[PDB]
DNA sequence: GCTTGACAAAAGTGTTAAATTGTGCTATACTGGGAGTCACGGATGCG
DNA sequence: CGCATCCGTGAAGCACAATTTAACACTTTTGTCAAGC
């Protein structure tokens, strides 16, 4: 999604079709990941770069 | 058009002048469009009678 | 071209009032608005040498 | 572990207008600039 | 060959053609949702 491994950001459907899921499924799992990672318990380590 | 490096046209000694056996002023006149110089001549019209 | 027009007008109009014309006076005769005149004056700028 | 469909915002196509950039042209006659020196070693030549 | 003397260097204004910007309608895609199967 963010292209961290290659540098090319990808749209939803473009990475939904590499697996066997729709674009909205990619959106749903992305929302899950954003909700889980955004929580302070993990963001406390990553925040200090530009807190 | 061709061009000659100034460091060798003059400098006491003038490397170009010594190389070609021309005085600095004579060489200066040729490089800088002030006098003509004969590049070569054919003997077939010098020793032909 | 327009830079020369501006320069000549600025040089000439001084005798009318005894001051170096400002953007208002210049615009009043160049038929252009002050902001464009300021842009022209900036555009007429020339680079200085580092070796000074 | 995830689909159908429906809406609105953002990413593209294309035509047109406006501005921005480059080359040419002007016919009385006029015809050649002007700017604030000495000291050093090396090439030439004299007997 | 032994050295002196001269020599050059350094220190006024527009017309028309072509190119380039950035307006806008429209199209497509991308992101988003409740409700749900």
Phi, psi for residue C20 in degrees, rounded to 5: -70, 120
Positive or negative torsion for Cα C5, C6, C12, C16: positive
Q: What is the resolution of this structure in A?
A: 3.9
Q: Chains meeting A at 3+ CB pairs closer than 8 A?
A: none
Q: Which nucleotide is nearest to B10 (CA to C1')?
A: E9
Technique that determined the structure: cryo-EM
Please confirm whether the linkage preceding B13 is cis (ω < 30° from 0): yes
* Residue C27: its H or E element: helix C23-30
CA distances from A28 to A14, A15, A32, A37 (A): 15, 13, 6, 14
Q: CA B32, CA B19: separation in Å to the nearest integer?
A: 18
DSSP state of B45: G
CA of C1 to C1' of D22 (A): 14
What are the structure tokens assigned to A15, written together? 């990475």
- Buried b or exposed e, range A25-51, using 16+ CB within 10 angstroms: ebeeeeeeeeeeeeeeeeeeeeeeeee
């Amino acid at each position: 999604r963010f292209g961290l491994t290659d540098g090319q950001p990808r749209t939803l459907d473009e990475i939904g079709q590499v697996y066997g899921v729709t674009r909205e499924r990619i959106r749903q799992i992305e929302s899950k990941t954003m909700s889980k990672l955004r929580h302070p318990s993990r963001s406390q380590v990553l925040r200090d770069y530009l807190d | 058009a061709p061009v000659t490096h100034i460091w060798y046209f003059k400098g006491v000694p003038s490397r170009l002048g010594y190389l070609l056996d021309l005085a600095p002023k004579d060489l200066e006149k040729i490089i800088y469009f002030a006098a003509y110089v004969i590049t070569s001549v054919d003997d077939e019209m010098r020793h032909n009678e | 071209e327009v830079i020369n027009k501006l320069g000549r007008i600025q040089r000439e109009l001084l005798q009318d009032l005894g001051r170096e014309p400002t953007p208002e006076e210049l615009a009043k005769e160049m038929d252009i608005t002050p902001e464009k005149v300021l842009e022209i004056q900036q555009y007429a700028r020339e680079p200085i040498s580092l070796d000074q």
